[model samples]
Target: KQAPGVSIITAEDIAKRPPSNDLSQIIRTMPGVNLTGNSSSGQRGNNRQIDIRGMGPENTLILVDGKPVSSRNSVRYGWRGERDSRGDTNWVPADQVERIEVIRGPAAARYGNGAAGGVVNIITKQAGAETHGNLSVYSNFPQHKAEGASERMSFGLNGPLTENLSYRVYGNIAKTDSDDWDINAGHESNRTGKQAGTLPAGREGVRNKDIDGLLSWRLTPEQTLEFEAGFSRQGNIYTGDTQNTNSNNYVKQMLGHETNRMYRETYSVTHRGEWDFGSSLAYLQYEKTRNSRINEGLAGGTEGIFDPNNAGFYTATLRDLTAHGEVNLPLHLGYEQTLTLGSEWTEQKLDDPSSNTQNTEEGGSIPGLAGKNRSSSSSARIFSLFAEDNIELMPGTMLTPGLRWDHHDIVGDNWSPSLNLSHALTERVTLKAGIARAYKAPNLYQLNPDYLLYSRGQGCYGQSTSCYLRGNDGLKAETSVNKELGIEYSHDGLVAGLTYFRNDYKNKIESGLSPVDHASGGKGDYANAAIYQWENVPKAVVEGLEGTLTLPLADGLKWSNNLTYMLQSKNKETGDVLSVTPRYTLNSMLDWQATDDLSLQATVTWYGKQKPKKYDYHGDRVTGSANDQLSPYAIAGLGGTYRLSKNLSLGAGVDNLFDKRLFRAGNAQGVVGIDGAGAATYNEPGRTFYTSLTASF
Candidate 1:
């Protein structure tokens, strides 16, 4: 009789764990869940963006079957093409997934608005009792480098299509390829002045393709209907261009030609009905994403000098559509009432086209010419109503009181309410607590009007400010207040959970050094700049602690461990310290079962170091004096699985194994512009190896 802090992972527990793609390796054994860099591209399932106690990744809110997905240009901005990849691994297909529910803290009054960092529901797979299929292949040869491969094919079908109609279908297809080996690029300074540009003896290739599908129907026994879809295509060609590596040399030859492409699509539908005179549920969802990249040669003109032709071409496009519907009613008295209403509409579009032509010898007469082909569109419509109550104050206790009211025509109304309490105190213990208030509405390219550059010292501060600066359209809307405490335990075979969270944010929108009036030659331009817009800054705090433990060694053997710790702060009247969070994180796992078919697993992860800020090139400003904290890493992996004949089965694992080499603090060199102002850094990739296999029939 225990269910306090819940955590469940299934898909046969990620086929015995280990083997990576970092879906946090099947919950990384639970407890605080932390994973940071190194595995290459998909880097362990491609960075899930979950940081519960530390609260980041836009307050962490990633759901699949339950909807809610959108991170927009992936936070932590400074231009660099507005960041993107906060899709957090789309969802649906870990072989159709059946379970994966993690709800740490701040339920957002019951899921709405970013959960303030907590909540990952993914729950696919249904329809069994018959047909099945499987196909798998894996490879990972690491002793010195290269040799990584993965392939998966699956099929499943469920019974009955009559007798009240019942049906189920599942499908999967996956592919991955890797080859990476980076050794700090010989002490990077923009690739030691090109000789073929050092620091790129690795990462020759990276690719990922995934597809998932699901369908369900039951129309009777209380009515049921479901549908799900997923697709992903990824590409990578690396060698540092930005993330920081001590600028210069034309930003390391434009980051040695960086190329990246990503595409994602998700669709969902659900309908559930219950009667006894009270019960209703409805759902609708759609998501679409397309990201394109081609950095070619970025070092533009005006400062850090390198005018091959002044090179700088960027293409960005994003389109998102979301439609939501929710209905739930059950109020039978005796303390049990629920009413949830919903309405969500979001439409976003952004396109940026840029071109710079160099040529300014002065003598030939060519004074002021900059390129721009921009487009921007924004929309958000939200309407919500919520009410919840679950009394039953005795015999194991239970009390949930909820309230939500949101009407955002643009950022006008917001009212969130929450009060949760659960208690068992026995039967193995269970206790929960909650307090919530969340809101984050300010995206549309942060209020459109493109053209961004923020660097000081050498020049290029767009719209004049002397160094680097761009962006301003009048901004606002950013708020938060969440608090949580949790505990739970299970008996026999042992299981445990713990949580502590706190978030206090207000108006937190940075970018301001003063000096206005520069919409590009509008006169009154000022200099000494760094203004983007949006402000309300006042408080920012994030406290954390996560916990997990599981044990059942012997006979079939099993062991698990998890931990998370975070402490973030920023009073920022104008003092940055909030870029890619990391205050300590750890994850662990181990499982075994030799014989009977075979199984084994192992994993480890850790991350720490994050403190870097202020950089803007093109307009100039490169004040550096310490603020590049990214140096703390650990990675390990091993996996196994075997069981042929009852419908075929085979699995393999080995990730990182030892090839570790990760660096990310700032500038991967690809933003030079010196004398007038330009700076660049961003690099994280090194260490590669992967494997996969699966089947069911």
Candidate 2:
């Protein structure tokens, strides 16, 4: 009853929603959850990360079948104030998810590490005695050959292979592209006879496919064994991420293009057993992830020899082993106690090499544009031992204390501890509080960089095309201390809850100038600028409030509402708000069951303007204000579903019902009068509609 800071989205909820691609759209409807930045991956970056309580997506942990998969972040220059450091969230097909559970608070004490911001656990359907299979297909309304046209197909099958064994198979395929973004061009690039005056360089084409399977068998009356394997690949082609920075280049900023190909695979085996006193589970898993990309410099849109030629290849292999045990301890004085212990060991190997190739044939010749051929491979092994005790001090009061010790080959050893309390103040009211410590190890690329990037990425701080970024092995792991307090009340059909949260961080790492730095005239266009390296900063903090309310609207109808407000976030030294953090948010969902086979719903999501404190830099040096406000925007949607038969159904929905030209903070450059980020193309799609058909047997 004290699960006050969590939300659950069930499979039934998925069937009633209109969807063309990924599951991120469903989760985006919840309050306390926010997203920023453009997704370089598939599905428009909707699945990029779970940004909860001002914490960027990296802060939240994403798991499947109770297992946490490992991944690396996508690199996006901070020219837009928001960076895309998101890991893999597109591997799991929507149909594969049976439920999505989210803990919207500090969960390090129980889950550890990335759980500091929160945890998103995507539970997959289990195999059982009964046979089941489903197929779903969805598509966006066709345009006259627009880039944003999209289509998707997914299917799942699960059944018993034998009396004591069961099996499952799932797969999905999807395609999406940019919406022919318009740069408000004065009818100049209108040669295509299509996008007259609109931006001609921002088109994107993406293709994705994935397949997965699981097998489970009963070893004994009390023991079960399971095996799983999955593979996924995404190919994305975009011509807009990079553009001209100055008028010296005739090519508009939107005239650049790049291609990114990502591949991922996962394998795991698990064993679980139960006994009278307690239960135990053990698991072993492995993952292989890789990203290969190539980009161009705008100047003449790939015509200038000295303009651009950049390529990056990154790969990582992860191996993990985990063992967990729980037992009930006898207690006296009318108190009960439970003890839990778990140990996890992981190994990560990385191979990342990048270069700024001149490709002599292309006449590419930038003297300082050095290209490095790095054949470096690095590995790290991490071990964690954690334990926790849950004590029931009274009939309706519980206390939990946890501790974990982690050691990594590179960062050394560290200890984390946490405390939590929950009490029922009355039959219908409860109070909860917790405090915990969390840490994030440096990403593989961060700890072992081998890149020849000069102007791309953070090398030039997203500005000048002269600085080079070098690898730094002295980077420290980032850490955070999180605390939360909340009260929840529920009676009859009415429910309400409020929670306040605060997260304090230290040793935050960022890319910056090298120790032996040198800059002339302090001008950004460097002659001999300082070498960029990953470095650590002093401190930062994030605080926020979350509120939820649910009640009845009318016969066979219900209403649900939620609001999230950021209290403040600041840097201890600079006293500025954090980047990519929103100030406030609102979400409302209405559903009506007009009949046994038909249902309708309406949703409104209001994303409060973000006053993200980002450094205004012209090349290498910080220039103007410490922060600025992004246009606050809201989107309303309407959707419905109808059951045609026991084995078939139809669903449809419209997003951006009002066709609002909403803009996001990070990508607002021309629209908001900024300089580096995307100009008019940073806003939401004008209007979108989708329909799907689902059949099961």
Candidate 3:
């Protein structure tokens, strides 16, 4: 209750309005959440992920059942710190979630690593003593044929096998078709002023297959043990998208085909005990991911482009093992307090031959790398110890102090400290504040000395034709100091709150612009290329405001609203926005429980204008048309659920009721002018009708 930057969505809430497929569709309605591309360049605009507070998708940590999910790490990381994967949020189906906890700012520091923006923990349903089964089917159809459609079916079953044993199982199968190849052909390139061939591509489609099972044993009244295993497969349907919006015949030929697939498997064992002292919890988990995709170019203007010569599929495998234990003790110590101690260890191993194939031979010979061949494998281990104390300072006042120490085998060690306070000012008003330090270790690809990428003059920083981008072993960890303060009011059935957050980010890693060593090694060996390494930037800042309001209008009618405003999100050194996001966003919903088995709802979301970056990725000023900003827009939705019988229910909804549609133009620095289609980043589908049928027994 003390944390200011936290929100929870329960299964009851999801049952009223379920997502079509991915859980992110509903999670984005929360404050401080937005779906955006990793960078402002808008290369992979259609593949937008969950970006929090404009910190980019990479900063958001995803978890399932309190365990970290890192399957996206198998994809290659581009020079701009962007990835080709759609992130780890879609692994779990929406209907299977029990609750979702969105933690932001200082409250998220305790999780450690890649949580500079926040954390999204997806909790799955557990086995219960009662034997029950459920089946749900959902389908979505768009008014326009150019857009894609979705269909999904999921089932869940759980029962008590014996007096002390129980089991739960779930499965899902879903598919969404890819958009038409010429969906965005009406728009032209803003920079080159070309049509047809240069138009940006639309969103790709995905097929999901998942199966999971869990078994629980009650050893005693106070002790329980659980075992779980799961497998998932996700395949992508291509839509002729290239990183730079420049495509070739191969890209066109591969359209509507399955170009990439991801297979993931997870196994875990957990123990929980409630003793006289307090409670103890421990878990051990293992995960493996196999990413298979077609070959693509690795450098310059051709980066991420389909290479016709190497048309076969290649696989990159990643394995992870994690162990965690925690205990909580309650004590007096003059003041009521609860002391918590925990420790975690994780090891990640990756074997990707495709990404590390660019050696010195392909990237022009360099003196520093005479006969070095890029290694196809990398590994890292991280261990952490954390302690937190929750104490009652005085009447109606609580204080929480926490400390954590983490050691990465490759990046060394880091210490993080945090403090949170919650005090009641009156019967209806309360104050909450928090401050904490968080850090993220460098990824495996960035720490490998042999990883290399080559580019021609177009990708060079200082007019060097033959350039090479290499990885550095001496990169420091990225750190952030997050702080938040807020006030909340609650009386009767009305609730309101507002929070201000700021994060001072340091040591942000990026591909260096300056040359590390002469590419020719001063031997007059000819190639006048320069070698660049990944280096850490000095500083960046992210500040924002979030507000929430809930009103109980009538006996069964309620209204809820949330707003997020970005004050500042930029790199202080280069004056560039960290990621492209709306200036302001507002979400509002009205829910009414008309009858015993019927519920109705309406939702509307308003997005402020989004402006493109003023400078290019190479730090050069962008000089072009002034109408490069996406104007403000709003989306409205209407939905409801009706229960016909005790074991069956029906749901239907219409999204983008006004048919307000947007399309991608070009994925480059300059944006389309007012004369052309205004939106240049991503496509927004219009007028979609969705329905669902659920049965339970």
Candidate 4:
């Protein structure tokens, strides 16, 4: 039977495919899903952002066994800045997943908030009825010089504790050492005072570790319960030459020479129970998550001359709890219906000490920083109720209508309703259509007080006056309405599907200009300086089409392909792209079985150019800024595995085989010189490769 919503990939499907550590690579065959990143592992890099159709990652919600994973920044972080390090989807290990479900379109009406785009549910492996375990080791090397190298080791165990109880545990540790490649020479600089060109050859590296487990208990034939948890840690380090000339220069300079480090940790847990109540079935569940990050770095002269004290730091904590109950029953009209009702409450706190300091004398302490000695806290309580009914309109046709009402204690009230119709035109064809309304609640950081220092005289802003920008406390929520239509066909080992969608958004929050003081060259006491804040932008629209095709080759052999194309526009006044999405993306894969114990697979991905949005940094103008554009690029890879025995397997694969060099539009070139006195900085790593292995017992 076809999976619910869309394509569902299982562990067996992944095992027969080439090695890909990036979770996105695992789902590229799903309709409308595209992987965006500049790194070899698809782990880091400017394009690390994910786009479904035309909707941004912020509108998309990712779940691990139905539980949210908390992270420091919100979804917009990827779109707003020059960097693509937003969203926390990289916190999970691919080896631990048993299956994945992709539900395209607005699911906020059922999953709570932040579902304007879609939902990705990663279901981990659980204990089977019998005892079993497996272990494997994997590794890979890229073809490009001065690239990156990666290695991973993993193990898994699953078994039954009793006749009605079972459990599964899995873990993996990986480390990667990457060399920076100078693709375009050092020309642009970033806010960290680092060149945007590339990591100096042989001085870039990152380490990551992940662990997860699941347990299930069957109370009776009609009742069952389950619990699951996961943990992840990631750290990145880089050493390179300095780009700034003056040791005391305050302007935004990308000192090519420096050492930088960033780290993050995430944890989550969930519980779910199911029961059969005579004529109806019911399900109840709850989930929670916690995440944090630390960033520290320094640039300038060597040794004591370049004080390590000239560094910065940021930390944040997020907690969310959700409870839901769903039931399916028979109606008198000779139709069946399912109703899901639930509520979710989320709380977040941010503590950013970097905004509280100034470039005090080498070893001096910064004073009068507003957030240094303080922290900001925000809470959102959503009382939501939803009902979905599937009525049989004809012999082979069904109509599903759903309505959701949510009362947000902090953001006010909202209602989202949807209707979907599905009909079996023939034994091999199915048609579907739907419309939905969705909303994305404001994140804590967007509402908290965050600040950054902008130097003007240092040629940082086209050689204008320097200044500081802060956050806006009073911000409104962003909302949107989406409409969609699609169809699916399956026959004789072949399957295909296509969908078209559009969304209208209002009250979009974005950065706004503030009053400035020219006399001080925009530089004033921290407390008296002007501040940049977020405001509700009027309106925008996004529309797109996505499709997928799958075919069976020979015995146990298969091939799959997927494509996505989108168009977005915004109001002239906002200067923000309503879509800021890729024009086109394509992914294809082929799997082959050499024997019962050996398999081989290959994959290719392509992305089209993206239209650039307006550039705004401080209050200065940048040169050659017209509309920034990101070029299109393609990547290909191949891998295979040989089962050593019933309980042992070894695998390996090569990524970025062509050593493609890609960059995003804005951050691609780095921050421009605002004061017109200093050079611009850029930040991006060159091509790289990686591999891994696992074993079971």
Candidate 5:
């Protein structure tokens, strides 16, 4: 069953800004969306991930053209200032998109694991009668930091090749010389800011490129076949601070001079057919991905001391193939109803050929995996079955029920079910409600602690190589149950809705002190040192209320706003309030179509106060670190678009108009010892400007 509420973002709405910005902007106009990037990392667009309904990105499922896309990894080592992680949203080539569908509530009974929070499905454009294409370039102004002069380019074309055949192709590329934080040297705040002593141009740069193509053939009036392919390469340089710094305020980085690269390729084929009584479709996909790291950080030792854990070549690859088919049938059992049946199968394998790499249970020395007796497994076979029934109880009342069963090679089995209903209260008002169960299996990497991922290193009180780990085979799948009730009102030029939702989490999976002890000694090289492993805690609950408003103020002016309140979020086991959960959030926008060819857009976003400390300096278990309180902040933006000709247009926009350092939750907890030092402060860039010129025919 679908969620109680859904939102659609059209291509026209997404075009409000240049494609150079983070792809997360596509949801800028939607409710319950938090698209914040890690400000300190300086990799703005590169790190933007959508957090729906206050849930983490890891819980949300993202699909492109109805096919699942692999997510990005958040944990990485051998690099300095590299904490944030995000999905490869930009790899989809925005120009080829027709529309975006966002489901904002849990319905694991539908799309699977990650859907516990929500789902975002990108619908790609097919060939059309009129040939169309555009080329554009964009860059950000370096006003506050030596974040380097960024340059981005994009191009796309689509048309028909035959009476029943058509094709479309798109590509985009972006480059930057690192997000140089120290570039504004000696500039007042640079002298007083938390990153004050960090060196400039520790110079890690980026070169990213993405391309995708689609071919569609209308075999007959009732049948169609499509083939889609995508390829992308994302490469970045990690050049750490190389010089000595003033001991009082500044210091050098952890790693020095290395390269990280990613190569991803995806392909899928689909067939759709409509019969006299129902419709059916079949799809197959093949995806391969590889990530490599060539490091020299500890090669020659000394500069930072050859830490034994550094200097090496590591690579990991994933190959996956998936196939699925779905059919719909009409059923008349007194009440009019339609049922959908679907089955899916996936074969995936991982290969890692380096120390501290994924693919198997392989790390440095440990007593036979610490006597855990775990094997070196590297493949997973996934299978699933789903059924959904659409029931019409009355003329204006409908009910939908769904169930899904999933089995995996690693995490065992799971079954999810859901019920949703909608009734018309009146002509302009409607009511909806839904209850669903969701579960998430352990990830390949998390199931097997074969890699050095997401650790805080020395900060954990171990050696420099002290890993933040909590992987175990005995771990259970995390599960949750969610329910929501909503009401909607619609009229000419106006649409609005309010929803209340609550989620109950059980057997929450998290890392903790392993039954093993911390005896890595001073060297920090942890081996079979059962120091940390993931375990299922008791339970957690989150209650929320969300509202959306839109109105056409005049013939050419429009106003819209969204507000969300996290009524309560807590751990039932420890009775502790969850940290980093913003109490309130608000997003407002004003759109004015001044003329047929000119329009203005403005937006304001506010992230409510949140508890900064989930754990203490050692961890969140005891007291909040120094400055554990985070305040709320708001900022505004202004953008305008002008038509230059029948087939050409220009756009200009400025983000952070008032120049405020708005803090994103969970990003300011790295290392702050004092109250006002702004330690580990992560924020949006100050007053950034971007412009784009396009020629479409």
Candidate 6:
């Protein structure tokens, strides 16, 4: 059945406007999708990720071939809920993708935790019966020398290894240079002239190296088995980004340096069987992430700042193991029905000595932590069970009901129930609606009492001289009730749909602002300081409207468009926008097949004005004029592909055709004395040209 909150991107779609380094460029073109900083605080602005609806990036779950990708968890979570790591979307190169399934709203609830916003599942091409080999080379050149450029090379091979066995392998190497370290030099502050120091960093660069292999064996006519392994390394080319926009001499010395590297490895075994009464599927997978980086301060004004005193590399490791089993049965009990039963178990272990050395004892005895004795490791386990039934209630109606239960070792249990209905109103029209509950468990950092962070009075809640923020073992899992309704119409060469979605968010977690009363044996000068822990927040709501239209103009010409309008997205208690997203967005694309061997496309995206937070990070109300906001902007692009021969093809394109660009000035507050408070929180690249060559045998 067609669900209201589902979208699919095919390989052909990717070829139209290939990304330079990240797939986020194409994914953001979809309705209800946007690129946003981890939180509205807007620190590490250049490290934006895929934000589904209004939920922050933390709520979006990334998957590769039906398995969760949690490597980003190894990064330290900042006080303002920021992470320096790029999201999990770029693990698989674009050339290896067969299709991408974007599931949102109630349809995503069945995935259990870490999917309160939605799920992006990347499905790679599989081994085929016939042997095949392919190679692709891509490059991008920026018009401005200060801007970064990128190049990528990838190869894929697949063939039958034996009568009953087949194998597939793929590898990629790519690099995107860092933007000139001082691109934002002149735009640092509108009030205080030049601050006599390094300006906030521009967009950082990245180097990616990835390889994966899969082996499939047909044990029998009714059964099959598969083994898979993959590894990827992502190293960031630093441009001097700091958490508080306070770049020091140490940060400048590291310009164009490789500040951090993340290595991720995965292994899995899968089985599928066809039975007379049903079909069964099962899988066991393991994932490991090694995050190595230059040490950064974890205290006060120096938080996230490169530490000059400790300039060595430190490594943090995270390991995850998961097992899943499911069965599907078809029955004829008066009406057509299909039932699904599944269960999943996952465990995660993290060890990070880099972030556990912060001093939290300022005179107060932390309830469960001892000074200089905190462990550098933590672990969590989750077990889930789910069931779903799809029923044909009437001649033109289908109903799907589902329920899921998850037990988290630290947060207890949660139950999610969902219902979806699709009804054919007429020959070319359908009505679709759904509602479900989704959740996100507290991360390892938030649940461990040993993970402590320090802050001076400026970042403290009340009037204490200094304060400490520690993890809490009693944090509740964040949850959301998602609802959506829509109508779709399809006819000869034309399709249109409109959907309305809303999510009621609850138990959202954040570092505590209020102090916890506690005592300890230390009677130093800092003994009267306040202590805080990770805590849950009040309710929040996100509501929006999405519309899509596709028109076939001629035999080989088509035009497609999608629009997302945000009606409301705010926290009930604080009245702050969930994340800095456009009030409305419109994406349009036109594709034409000029000839049998050539294709052309044009695309444009219009983003509405973005509003800034009413208050600063200290929870102090700011005057309306002090708040920064971004005005509406539009980006245009043109691209095409030419098939040179049966075995070779070439692709070329221009991005940001009009040279529309924006520069980053500072973090969430934009510039200290600037008007419009936050317009310069991130940077948008200017016009760029790119080309790709692919060969197949």
The lowest-lDDT stretch of 10 consecutive residues in candidate 2 is: 38-47
Task: Give the CA lDDT, 0 to 100, for residue 637 in model 5.
Answer: 82
Ranked by lDDT from best down, the candidates are: 6, 3, 5, 2, 4, 1
> How does model 6 fare in lDDT?
0.85
Index of the highest-lDDT prediction: 6
Model 1 vs. true fold: TM: 0.32
Candidate 6 structure quality by residue, lDDT tens digits, 461-492: 55545678888888889899999999999888
Each candidate's lDDT (Cα)?
0.52, 0.60, 0.83, 0.53, 0.61, 0.85
Error of 2 at 454 (Å): 4.2
How many clashes in candidate 4? 55
Each candidate's TM vs. the true structure?
A: 0.32, 0.83, 0.96, 0.79, 0.83, 0.96
* Better structure of 1 and 5 per lDDT: 5
Provide the global lDDT of candidate 1 against the true structure: 0.52
What number of clashing residue pairs does each candidate have, in the order they appear? Answer: 66, 7, 0, 55, 8, 7
Per-residue lDDT, model 6, residue 121, is: 90
Error of 4 at 179 (Å): 3.9
Which one wins on TM-score?
Answer: 6
The model with the greater lDDT, 4 or 6, is: 6
263-307: candidate 3 lDDT, tens digit per residue? 999999999899899999999989999999998888776788888
The Cα error of candidate 2 at residue 148, in Å, is: 1.4
- lDDT computed for candidate 4: 0.53
Per-residue CA lDDT of model 1 for 292-322, tens digit only, reads: 5543222222222222443443444555556
Residue 286 CA error for candidate 3 (Å)? 0.8
Candidate 6 backbone collisions, by pair? 362-526, 363-527, 365-519, 365-520, 628-676, 628-677, 628-678
